[PDB]
Design a protein around this ligand. Structure first.
Ligand code: EIO
Length: 249
């Protein structure tokens, strides 16, 4: 029994339940951008239930977190385009609320499937490594003064030309989401994403901008803290690499 198949059946059943909620039809299929002519000038990451379902069938979601992140895009896009209190946004929120109810009902079964799909989710050294990285982001990097421009993805509605300049965006919330998915097995991949924040600031704001000085401070405190914990992090990375190669069945 392939655990990815079992997981995908669970996620598909949640989509069926969400589709059945009242007034949800505007979210069943992609927005038609030839009718909503300014949609892509406002929205960067379109999402809908049909695309979500086809992604499940493409086996793109190895865990509930990747699934839920795409589902939350439906709400975020509606809040941006239609408005935070618009009925469409309330409707989209009702779908996300139902998903969270179903995920909580099945949390123990989902945990077992997710660890069967990716054993590193159960590895104590991966969990400890990710916990340290998350604390560096929240306690050190997000605490840099005036670091707010880098905390969250840029909303195209408020910075309309941002993604015409920046094609590979990165922000601290996205890094935190990656940590919670245990995307990082060593400092190298983590530092690639951290440095993308700075590189994008140099490109969009310029090398001498106050925004870039803040991004430089964020990168520097990251290096400084990784150095302080270097002995511990090195042992974690070694033990993660051993566990990752033991997952060769
Ligand atoms: C001027 S408003 C703004 N500027 C931002 N940055 C990004 C870094 O370069 C400078 C400037 C373009 C970022 C944000 C976000 S937000 N969701 N509103 O759009 C909080 C994330 N707002």
């Amino acid at each position: 029994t392939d655990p990815m198949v079992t997981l995908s059946s669970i996620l598909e059943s949640i989509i069926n339940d969400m589709r059945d909620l009242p007034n949800t039809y505007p979210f069943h299929t992609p927005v038609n951008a030839k009718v909503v002519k300014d949609y892509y000038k406002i929205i960067t990451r379109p999402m809908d239930l049909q695309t979500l379902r086809e992604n499940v069938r493409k086996r793109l979601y190895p865990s509930r977190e990747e699934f839920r992140e795409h589902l939350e895009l439906i709400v975020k896009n509606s809040a941006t385009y239609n408005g935070p209190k618009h009925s469409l946004t309330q409707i989209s929120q009702s779908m996300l609320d139902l998903c969270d109810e179903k995920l909580k009902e099945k949390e123990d079964k989902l945990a077992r499937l997710e660890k069967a799909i990716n054993p590193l989710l159960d590895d104590d050294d991966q969990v400890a490594f990710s916990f340290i990285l998350d604390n560096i982001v929240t306690q050190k990097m997000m605490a840099v003064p005036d670091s707010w421009p880098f905390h969250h993805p840029v909303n195209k509605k408020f910075v309309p030309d941002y993604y015409k300049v920046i094609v590979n965006p990165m922000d601290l919330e996205t890094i935190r989401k990656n940590i919670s998915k245990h995307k990082y097995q060593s400092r190298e991949s983590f530092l690639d994403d951290v440095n993308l924040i700075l590189a994008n600031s140099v490109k969009y704001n310029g090398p001498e901008s106050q925004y870039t000085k803040t991004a430089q401070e964020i990168v520097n405190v990251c290096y400084q803290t990784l150095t302080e914990y270097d002995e511990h992090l090195t042992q974690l990375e070694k033990d993660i690499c051993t566990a990752k190669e033991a997952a060769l069945e």
